[PDB]
Amino acid sequence: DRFELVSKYQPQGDQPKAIEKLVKGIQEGKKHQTLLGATGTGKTFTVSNLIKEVNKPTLVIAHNKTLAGQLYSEFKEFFPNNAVEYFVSYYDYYQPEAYVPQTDTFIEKDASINDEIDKLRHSATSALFERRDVIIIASVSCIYGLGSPEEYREMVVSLRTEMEIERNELLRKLVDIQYARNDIDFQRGTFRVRGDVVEIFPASRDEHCVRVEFFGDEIERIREVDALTGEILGDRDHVAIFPASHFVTRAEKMEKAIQNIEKELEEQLKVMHENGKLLEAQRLEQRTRYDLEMMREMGFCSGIENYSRHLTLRPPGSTPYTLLDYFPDDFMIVVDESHVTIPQVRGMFNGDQARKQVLVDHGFRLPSALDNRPLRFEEFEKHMHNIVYVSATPGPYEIEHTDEMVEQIIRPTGLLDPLIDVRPIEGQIDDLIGEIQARIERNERVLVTTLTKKMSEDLTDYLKEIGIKVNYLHSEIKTLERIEIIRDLRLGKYDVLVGINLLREGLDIPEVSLVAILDADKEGFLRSERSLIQTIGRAARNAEGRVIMYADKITKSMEIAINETKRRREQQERFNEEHGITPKTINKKERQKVVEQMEHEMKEAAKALDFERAAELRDLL
Amino acid sequence: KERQKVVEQMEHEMKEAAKALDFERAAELRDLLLELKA
Numbered sequence A: 001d002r003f004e005l006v007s008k009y010q011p012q013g014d015q016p017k018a019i020e021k022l023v024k025g026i027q028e029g030k031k032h033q034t035l036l037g038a039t040g041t042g043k044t045f046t047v048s049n050l051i052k053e054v055n056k057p058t059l060v061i062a063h064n065k066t067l068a069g070q071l072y073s074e075f076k077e078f079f080p081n082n083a084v085e086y087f088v089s090y091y092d093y094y095q096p097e098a099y100v101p102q103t104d105t106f107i108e109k110d111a112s113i114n115d116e117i118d119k120l121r122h123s124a125t126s127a128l129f130e131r132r133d134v135i136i137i138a139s140v141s142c143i144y145g146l147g148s149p150e151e152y153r154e155m156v157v158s159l160r161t162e163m164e165i166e167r168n169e170l171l172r173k174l175v176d177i178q179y180a181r182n183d184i185d186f187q188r189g190t191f192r193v194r195g196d197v198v199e200i201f202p203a204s205r206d207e208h209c210v211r212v213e214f215f216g217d218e219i220e221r222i223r224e225v226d227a228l229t230g231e232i233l234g235d236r237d238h239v240a241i242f243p244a245s246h247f248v249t250r251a252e253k254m255e256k257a258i259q260n261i262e263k264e265l266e267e268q269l270k271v272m273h274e275n276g277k278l279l280e281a282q283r284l285e286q287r288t289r290y291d292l293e294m295m296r297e298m299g300f301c302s303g304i305e306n307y308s309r310h311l312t313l314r315p316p317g318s319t320p321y322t323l324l325d326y327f328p329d330d331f332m333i334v335v336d337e338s339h340v341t342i343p344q345v346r347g348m349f350n351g352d353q354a355r356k357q358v359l360v361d362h363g364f365r366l367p368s369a370l371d372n373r374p375l376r377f378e379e380f381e382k383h384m385h386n387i388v389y390v391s392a393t394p395g396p397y398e399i400e401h402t403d404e405m406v407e408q409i410i411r412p413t414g415l416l417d418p419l420i421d422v423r424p425i426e427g428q429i430d431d432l433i434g435e436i437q438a439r440i441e442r443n444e445r446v447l448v449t450t451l452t453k454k455m456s457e458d459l460t461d462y463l464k465e466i467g468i469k470v471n472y473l474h475s476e477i478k479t480l481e482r483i484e485i486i487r488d489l490r491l492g493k494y495d496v497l498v499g500i501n502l503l504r505e506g507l508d509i510p511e512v513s514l515v516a517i518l519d520a521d522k523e524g525f526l527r528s529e530r531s532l533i534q535t536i537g538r539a540a541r542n543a544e545g546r547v548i549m550y551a552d553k554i555t556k557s558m559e560i561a562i563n564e565t566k567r568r569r570e571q572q573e574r575f576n577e578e579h580g581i582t583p584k585t586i587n588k589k590e591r592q593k594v595v596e597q598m599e600h601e602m603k604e605a606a607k608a609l610d611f612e613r614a615a616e617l618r619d620l621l
Numbered sequence B: 001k002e003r004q005k006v007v008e009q010m011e012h013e014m015k016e017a018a019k020a021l022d023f024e025r026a027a028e029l030r031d032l033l034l035e036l037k038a
């Protein structure tokens, strides 16, 4: 079951040494290790190599789904013959259930499920039971509730050729595991029957189904077929069909769980009446007994997840089953951007618990709803066999638990850490204009970080008044719109981006030759050692990259950041000299509303692939 | 998987041409894609 790493690359720079150390670290049974890779060193190639050498099922955790998608695309290319999988929340958008006591307003759960994401989730969990050569790229969705892997495993329908089994008995088993008969619209999670042929569309597929051909009570053949075409893709001697749902509640357990929910309700109502929580008792009882009628009628009610722990018949406070449980005991976790991802993982339970206690306090939910929850960080720790944190700036968790850092500081094409200049706060804006103007003449772009909304808007406005092409990265710009703006910077539609936080997803672009840091000496979050080094990093994608920090004094964070930058650049230039390498970059209000409408139109015409209409609109613009 | 790989790759490249505003390339790619689907 080996990983086969496919790439146009060979390990370069100090990648071989980083790989060596990390592999030896796992051989030494080191639970925690940290890969201290400076930005642009190819840390994802390093991890690919680690994954190949250690050869365990591996979980890669990422802090946003844009980066998770980005890792997934890359790992599929790296391991085309192994099972690279994607595990993210299937919600296209998610408004959780919430209550605002201040305004006495309840927020209903609002959300739509993405069919492709649910598919990839099913593909992920079934793979863990089919083979060892599995890499999953996941969000913190990996610490959220899933049915019992033992049950999921156990509920598989196994079929093999020459097997005895009745056609209709197969139908019954498939229903029992949440497949639906649909002869007319045959989709995933669905079976269709034509005489002696059953076609099952696995929940893990939207592309290929399993055709099972009977002769009497015996399977003659099993074929992977193209669902739409009927074109045979291959014969199988064996197929495992996994449940179409990650939480199936058979009719027997549901009856009992309804027993237990009623009793819990009966006890909570008692306690609330004694404490004169009359409103909250009325509300809770209406809601719960309605939920309970629906379960008795349909075996389903909306927001049924609030009852997950009851439906399992497990005692209160029980750790949820998560994806972590689907993995063998001997698996590896890689935590991408660990300084961000680790605090996020810890923050999920507490955010969840806070939101749900205001619902239990005010009678919208039973206390058992809190058992429908992500893992506690102490629970996530229990799943750590070998964990490798990946970060240019490791957090205090990683630092504490790692005996020695594995450093990786050398870039494939020899690109250096930028030159840093410290310049006074006085004459700040004017000094910067000059540096921007000079970058404009050179067909290079600029990133600039301000501490405030106020300075960002003032400087953006002033730049615009001057004839400079600029965009303010406002904080409430979503990453989808962010990426559009960044694409436009790359194109030279803008020459400068001004933002408070430049550490937001996707801001590493080769065309940027200058990063300017206003108020570098104000510490806080924005001017911490971590923020400074990451911000410096944005200038390291360009062979003439440079940072300017405006500051009247050198704070502790400036010192560590400037020191580390200068130290790496030194070793990097030594490597380059010693290896014969030359660093090379890898690669008016009325007008305003008209442009925003035609742009939307141009973008719509592009999604529709009416590229001619999108051209007409670009030329209009 | 190899056909589907190239098709799926062509699509990426078409969306990318479009994001560069290189709608001329994107159309060239769309038209090739339609022939291959046929």
Ligand SMILES: Nc1ncnc2c1ncn2[C@@H]1O[C@H](COP(=O)(O)OP(=O)(O)O)[C@@H](O)[C@H]1O
Pocket (backbone or CB within 6 Å): A009, A010, A011, A012, A015, A037, A038, A039, A040, A041, A042, A043, A044, A045, A412, A586
């Ligand atoms: N051994 C290698 N040879 C050539 N190119 C590489 C190698 N390793 C990584 N790269 C490429 O060099 C660039 C810099 O890597 P990147 O992934 O941005 O680093 P990081 O993940 O640390 O920010 C990327 O385009 C990456 O795919």
